[PDB]
Amino acid sequence: MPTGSVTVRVPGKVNLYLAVGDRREDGYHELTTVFHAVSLVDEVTVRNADVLSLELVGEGADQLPTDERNLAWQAAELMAEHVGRAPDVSIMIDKSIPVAGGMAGGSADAAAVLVAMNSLWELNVPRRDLRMLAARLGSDVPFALHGGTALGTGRGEELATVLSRNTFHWVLAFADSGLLTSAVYNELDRLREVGDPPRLGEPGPVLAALAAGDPDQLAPLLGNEMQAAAVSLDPALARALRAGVEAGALAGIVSGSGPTCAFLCTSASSAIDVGAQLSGAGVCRTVRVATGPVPGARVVS
């Protein structure tokens, strides 16, 4: 019967700051990160149906599974189970977060499914239950629910919200192929065995520049301890980082293990010109402008 539909908009993210602790056993690394949600988004529409189904549209959407191995599918199952229900829902995802872009689009979709089902079934399970479900689903789901900018400590503990005085303007560029996050951690571990790569300061100055809304202040503090390793596995990333800056960006970094390179610019006009130049210059398959921070998963219907 029921018939209505709920759509939830949810953003991709970039890492403005990433410190990576020394390898533990069993083999993991403790991460400290400043997450920043930006205006490349997916929209996820959920309706009552006879059985659970999932469909995706948008560039690259045809690469993605539409069964259990999709995190948005797992989210519906977990959300339904949480409230003792069958996940009798159909899910349609309009994808504009670049696929395999390293912006955590799968985790964004999972978070949007939680929020959408909450509203469609008129439940209001509390935000803290959604966060607990997000954490079972995978380590980037919680931030997709939180959005804006947050500091995360990698310990299962609560994200710390950071507010910004003004909006920031980015160019995001995506390589034609990503790297295995496994390969990047191994290469990080190796470079730390044979040399002394860049160790970042603690994140307080990043937070203070974000708070000030000041891109000239934030630009030189952007940092990623995985970057030297990504750049050792894919040396073109170094030229690409230079081109973005030559094109007029304040600074660029690789986000996470890649493929995103994120370039902070001084303004919307400036981001449009840097993006036009980069796109013209051929270093990257895809170039897009975005702003941040933007909100996490929210109903927009």
Ligand X SMILES: C[C@](O)(CO)[C@H](O)COP(=O)(O)OP(=O)(O)OC[C@H]1O[C@@H](n2ccc(N)nc2=O)[C@H](O)[C@@H]1O
| Shortest Cβ 292–ligand X spacing (Å) | 17
Query: Which of 39, 181 has the CB closer to ligand X?
Result: 181
35 binds ligand X (CB under 6 A): no
Residues 112-171 that bind ligand X (CB under 6 A): 139-140
Active-site annotation holder among 42, 95, 109, 140: 140
| Backbone conformation region of residue 196, classed left if phi is above 0, alpha if psi is from -120 to 50, else beta | beta
Among positions 39, 90, 181, 301, the unique one binding ligand X when judged by CB under 6 A: 181
| Shortest Cβ 49–ligand X spacing (Å) | 30
26: annotated active-site residue: no
95: annotated active-site residue: no
CA gap 80, 280 in Å, rounded: 47
**Rounded to the nearest 5 degrees, what angle is found at the Cα of 146, between the Cα atoms of 61 and 122?**
80
* Strand 223-224, strand 5-20: pairing: parallel
- By beta carbon distance, the residue nearest ligand X is 29
| Shortest Cβ 293–ligand X spacing (Å) | 18
CA gap 280, 283 in Å, rounded: 9
Among positions 17, 168, 174, 185, the unique one binding ligand X when judged by CB under 6 A: 185
Check whether 105 is labelled as a binding-site residue: yes
Among positions 4, 28, 204, 235, the unique one binding ligand X when judged by CB under 6 A: 28
Nearest residue to 137 via CA among 114, 160, 118: 114
Check whether 108 is labelled as a binding-site residue: yes
User: Annotated binding site, which residues?
Assistant: 98-108
Residues interacting with ligand X, by CB under 6 A?
Answer: 27-29, 31, 139-140, 181-182, 185, 256
Residues designated as active site: 13, 140
